[PDB]
Design a protein around this nucleic acid. Structure first.
Ligand SMILES: Nc1ncnc2c1ncn2[C@@H]1O[C@H](COP(=O)(O)OP(=O)(O)O)[C@@H](O)[C@H]1O
Length: 258
DNA sequence: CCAGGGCTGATCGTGCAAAAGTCGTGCCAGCCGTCT
């Protein structure tokens, strides 16, 4: 029941809500999903579901479902008790076996390949996985949480991603709102970042913010968000490179040439 | 004076696979027994 807390940083009255919705499902062991756009602050949330569960005792391995080897998929996922180096006592590890009693994080689910998608399937609800070799398969108790920024329904129409896997996985999908829509925690997010930032670049103390600064930073549709705010602020700050006069200028894109 | 961290050394490991070798049986050439 212990709470990690970390950096909730939400003053949205909709991030509050976001925290509230996930909290109810934290105890739950059902498959879940997390959906975010290019700038959504979702990695913390996957941890905030498992951080808040009874099985908070469990290990929280989270694989990157996009980078696995096509060829080693069978081995990587399951693993083979015989290990290596002959009569060696060292046993093979495994993917799904190394997450019993703890939440498993799957990322880039939409991007995950057809071989991976078919391979998932059949292990999601059955609970039995058999390592290459042998005649015995052992049930694992593993909690599926999936984070994706891509739109699943469109993928289903295309046929690129199997429809059944998506349907079976996550009864409830958490909704994350874009930053242009928070619109409120920027005064707060922006300072927090900048405050960190001052010690990473080794300044003492923030100068302060011009009103204009805040006219620009409110006023913009912020394409691929949050992370975006950090970048707009972190650069702009190191840019300025001092602590006499307050911060006066922020650049949205360091592309434009001048 | 007692507990925590580092580091060295002590310990466990008789097989998998690649190429050379043998195996059995067939194909064909050359000698020899016998009838016409
Ligand atoms: N509520 C928050 N509190 C603190 N930091 C946040 C929050 N939301 C976003 N961030 C910052 O923005 C980044 C979000 O990246 P991430 O969630 O990994 O993107 P994605 O979910 O698209 O992979 C993090 O590195 C984090 O520092």
């Amino acid at each position: 029941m212990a709470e990690y807390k970390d950096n909730l940083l939400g003053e949205a009255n909709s991030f509050l809500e976001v925290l509230e919705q996930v909290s109810h499902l934290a105890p739950l062991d059902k498959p879940v999903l997390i959906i975010g756009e290019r700038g959504t602050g979702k990695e913390l949330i996957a941890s905030r579901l498992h951080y808040l569960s009874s099985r908070w005792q469990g290990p929280f391995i989270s694989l990157n479902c996009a980078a696995l080897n096509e060829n080693l998929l069978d081995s990587e996922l399951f693993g083979h008790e015989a290990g290596a180096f002959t009569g060696a006592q060292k046993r093979h590890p495994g993917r799904f076996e190394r997450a019993d009693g703890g939440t498993l994080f799957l990322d880039e689910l939409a991007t995950a390949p057809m071989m991976v998608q078919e391979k998932l399937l059949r292990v999601i609800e059955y609970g039995e996985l058999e390592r290459v070799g042998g005649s015995q398969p052992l049930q694992v108790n593993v909690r599926l949480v999936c984070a994706t920024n891509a739109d699943l329904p469109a993928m289903v129409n295309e046929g690129t991603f199997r429809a059944d896997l998506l349907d079976r996985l996550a009864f409830d999908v958490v909704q994350l709102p874009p930053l242009r829509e928070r619109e409120s925690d920027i005064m707060l997010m922006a300072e927090y970042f900048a405050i960190q930032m001052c010690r990473e670049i080794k300044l003492p103390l923030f100068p302060g913010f011009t009103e204009r600064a805040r006219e620009t930073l409110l006023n913009y549709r912020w394409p691929g968000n949050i992370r975006e705010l950090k970048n707009v602020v972190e650069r702009s700050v190191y840019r300025h490179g001092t602590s006499d006069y307050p911060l006066d200028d922020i650049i949205i894109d360091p592309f434009k040439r001048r």
